[PDB]
């Protein structure tokens, strides 16, 4: 779980030493980031339903076949659309967790680790999720430090996918 506080103590603990000014500066950086991260999480949470639905519809528009082709991995039927909305909701919710935590640790532990085996086994293309993340980027309406931090997590998920 990579966050500034956790990483700082882990570096110190592996060295078996008390926290020095280096770890304190890490905490100061976390403190500078934290408020923008928390209100970005709030803004994403309040707009979560429309963002997830819009991201799913964006994937359907760019990849129409996912709504016409019959298959377990496609969203042609109602359950496929539910799986897709739930997956994008997973991505959005875990991004907020990254925003409140201050690092990619929630994405790493909950979503990124093993996602390649998921997509290979269940025949889900990472390109679909890339477009969902791209829609979330373009429509979250965040600004300043909030947008920067949120887009870094969204780009982290995209870079892991592609």
């Amino acid at each position: 779980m990579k966050t500034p506080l956790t990483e700082a103590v882990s570096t110190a603990d592996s060295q078996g030493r008390f926290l020095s000014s280096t770890e304190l500066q890490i905490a100061f950086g976390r403190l500078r980031q934290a408020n923008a991260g928390l209100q970005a999480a709030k803004a994403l949470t309040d707009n979560a339903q429309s963002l997830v639905n819009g991201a799913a519809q964006a994937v359907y528009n760019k990849f129409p076949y996912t709504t016409q082709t019959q298959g377990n991995n496609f969203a042609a039927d109602q359950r496929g659309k539910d799986k897709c909305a739930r997956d994008i909701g997973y991505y959005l919710r875990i991004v907020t967790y990254c925003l409140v935590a201050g690092g990619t640790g929630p994405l790493d532990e909950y979503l990124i680790a093993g996602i390649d085996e998921i997509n290979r086994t269940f025949d889900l293309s990472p390109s679909w999720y890339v477009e969902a993340l791209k829609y979330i980027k373009a429509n979250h309406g965040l600004s300043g430090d909030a947008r920067d931090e949120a887009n870094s997590y969204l780009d982290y998920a995209i870079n892991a996918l592609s």
Partner: protein, 289 residues
């Protein structure tokens, strides 16, 4: 060696597994085999996700830029190793895990705990890992080009206390060293402090009483101090470890694991009593004579 009890224990898969050596001018299959063996043994049979693989260390080992020993050192010094074994564990458990991963054996005595805890506290985790790997024991057993492996069999500088403690640290082939009953607790803290041994209880596949673990307190001691006197006339006394006691239910059953010293003449009756309470016999050891 271990022949009759190899399958009962988890020793049988390692009996026909030869040590993984990277020969000079190795092939690409050889490099990959070493990578797989190091991941399995240094990381203690944890599943390694693709995002957790040390791509650079693998590349360097493949290229010959580093040896098997240096790759083992890089894996053991990685943040991957530290999240799995360092950051959430009491340092005595970290030492237990280091001995199992880097040396393939259990700690022998409290002196090893003293050395490694002092070295960790004075110079850090990386220096501690180096002492495991730059040790004379590592060089004579694995050297530079051999992946560390479990040393179940008797060797030159062994103590039989290490053989018993091996099965406190190793819990079967399909077990992952972070998926064991004691979880993050040190398995040998009491044992190394008191220079004592526990009866070997095999893994869950072949041993019905595999789940037996003594409690914090109120444990029956190993030997029968007093002889046959509390049991009237008796020939020999035996310590029986029993697990999964549930049938009478609480409050009649408080601890599901219980060790009892019983005479030879009551062994039959003891077995029936264990059967009624639904328990499983973990081990039976001579307690007298």
């Amino acid at each position: 060696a271990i022949t009759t009890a190899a399958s009962r224990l988890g020793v049988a898969p390692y009996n026909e597994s030869r040590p993984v050596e990277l020969r000079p001018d190795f092939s690409l299959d050889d490099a990959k085999m070493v990578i797989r063996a190091v991941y399995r043994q240094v990381l203690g049979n944890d599943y390694i996700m693709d995002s957790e693989r040390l791509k650079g260390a693998e590349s360097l080992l493949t290229n010959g830029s580093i040896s098997v020993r240096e790759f083992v050192r890089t894996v053991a010094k990685s943040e991957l190793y530290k999240k799995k074994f360092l950051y959430n564990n009491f340092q005595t458990r970290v030492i237990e895990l280091n001995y199992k991963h880097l040396l393939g054996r259990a700690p022998f005595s409290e002196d090893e705990v003293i050395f490694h805890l002092d070295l960790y506290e004075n110079q850090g985790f990386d220096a501690d890992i180096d002492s495991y790997i730059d040790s004379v024991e590592y060089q004579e057993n694995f050297g530079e080009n051999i992946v560390p492996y479990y040393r179940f069999n008797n060797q030159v500088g062994d103590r039989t206390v290490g053989f018993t403690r091996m099965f406190r640290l190793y819990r079967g082939y399909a077990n992952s060293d972070r998926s064991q009953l004691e979880r993050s607790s040190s398995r040998l803290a009491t044992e190394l402090g008191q220079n004592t041994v526990s009866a070997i209880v095999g893994p869950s596949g072949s041993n019905a009483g595999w789940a037996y673990r003594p409690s914090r307190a109120g444990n029956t001691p190993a030997k029968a101090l007093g002889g046959t006197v509390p049991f009237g006339q008796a020939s020999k006394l035996f310590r029986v470890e029993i697990t999964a006691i549930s049938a009478p239910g609480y409050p009649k059953v408080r601890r599901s694991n219980k060790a009892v010293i019983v005479p030879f003449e009551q062994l039959n009756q003891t077995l029936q009593q264990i059967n009624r309470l639904g328990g499983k016999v973990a081990s039976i050891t001579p307690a007298s004579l």
